[PDB]
């Protein structure tokens, strides 16, 4: 069977749809973008990934949103984790968060067909879109809230949009934030984030 065993003692076995949103602006060097992807693979490594447990998704964003992994893709964890590591560096002048959320609100979560499971959009931010693009930012985070989608922003660097990070965290309880200084601090904090994410999801009614 596709199967594949758990790599670590921490193997999140819950009902959850986690969307990885990767900041794709030149605010991160080609080299740091790696550290980041590694973080996502790292995170993935610690989740029981299958349509009937933890469902991953991977979108890298600058002007538009690029999805290398869809929630419904039935593929082997090793594979999804492979695609994960191959997300092409973009480094755009501007990477819009309002956009990736719009994309996340209207595209990734337009249908909440797996209601029994928690929905989380991990928003890894390392830049700050121009104020002329945030006109609908709150509409989205609230809309995503209407859909029971928790938003957990992770700011990386002196360039991260702290204003938006703090608002998201204020929009709802569950919406916690992780402000960091550099892509390095990520694997150092991996466990806290993932333990926080996993614990925000329900257990299987059986087991």
């Amino acid at each position: 069977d596709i199967s594949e065993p758990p790599l670590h003692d921490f193997y999140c076995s819950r009902l959850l749809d986690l969307v990885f949103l990767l900041d794709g602006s030149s605010r991160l060097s080609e080299a740091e973008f790696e550290v980041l992807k590694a973080f996502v693979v790292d995170m993935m490594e610690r989740l029981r990934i299958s349509q009937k447990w933890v469902r991953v998704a991977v979108v890298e964003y600058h002007d538009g949103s690029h999805a290398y992994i869809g929630l419904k893709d039935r593929k082997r964890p090793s594979e999804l984790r492979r695609i994960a590591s191959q997300v092409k560096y973009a480094g755009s002048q501007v990477a819009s968060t309002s956009e990736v959320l719009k994309y996340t609100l209207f595209q990734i979560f337009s249908k909440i067909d797996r209601p029994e499971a928690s929905r989380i959009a991990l928003l890894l931010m390392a830049s700050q879109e121009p104020q002329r693009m945030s006109r609908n930012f709150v509409r989205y985070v609230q809309g995503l809230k209407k859909k029971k989608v928790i938003v957990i922003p992770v700011g990386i660097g002196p360039h991260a949009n702290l204003k938006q990070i703090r608002l998201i965290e204020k929009q709802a309880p569950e919406n916690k934030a992780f402000v960091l200084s550099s892509v390095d601090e990520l694997e150092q904090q991996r466990d806290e984030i993932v333990s926080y994410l996993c614990d925000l999801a329900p257990e299987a009614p059986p087991p």
């Binding site: 121009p130 002329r132 945030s134 930012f137 709150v138 204003k163 938006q164 204020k170």
Partner: protein
């Protein structure tokens, strides 16, 4: 006293552009067009009359981007019941709009900055 394609008035150099873009892009442009320039800034009626001429090339009814931007967030709000708050919690809570002049009758219109329009640039050397 103004480079070609442009014009002159009261010691200023105005110029109309039929290029389409949102307020922020119009300003940007206007600046890059000639050091020390921004979007037209109507300081007097008779001034709004001359810019009215550099127009002619656009449909009647249309408007052009001008010196004023984000005119609702720059505001100071208040609750009829006195309830105080912290402006920080109010993130872009008002509509993001800019002002545009309509030559036809030179009446200003506060509309969404996002929209793409033409604009006039001015500056003084």
């Amino acid at each position: 006293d103004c480079p070609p394609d442009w014009s002159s008035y009261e010691g200023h150099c105005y110029r109309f552009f039929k290029e389409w873009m949102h307020w922020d892009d119009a300003e940007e442009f206007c600046t890059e067009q000639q050091t020390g320039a921004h979007l037209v800034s109507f300081q007097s009626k008779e001034e709004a009359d001359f810019v009215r001429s550099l127009t002619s090339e656009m449909l009647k009814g249309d408007v052009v981007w001008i010196g004023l931007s984000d005119v609702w967030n720059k505001c100071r709000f208040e609750w009829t019941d006195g309830m105080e708050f912290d402006y920080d919690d109010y993130y872009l809570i008002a509509e993001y709009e800019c002002v545009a002049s309509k030559p036809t009758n030179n009446k200003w219109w506060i509309i969404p900055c996002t929209r793409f329009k033409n604009f006039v640039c001015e500056f003084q050397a």
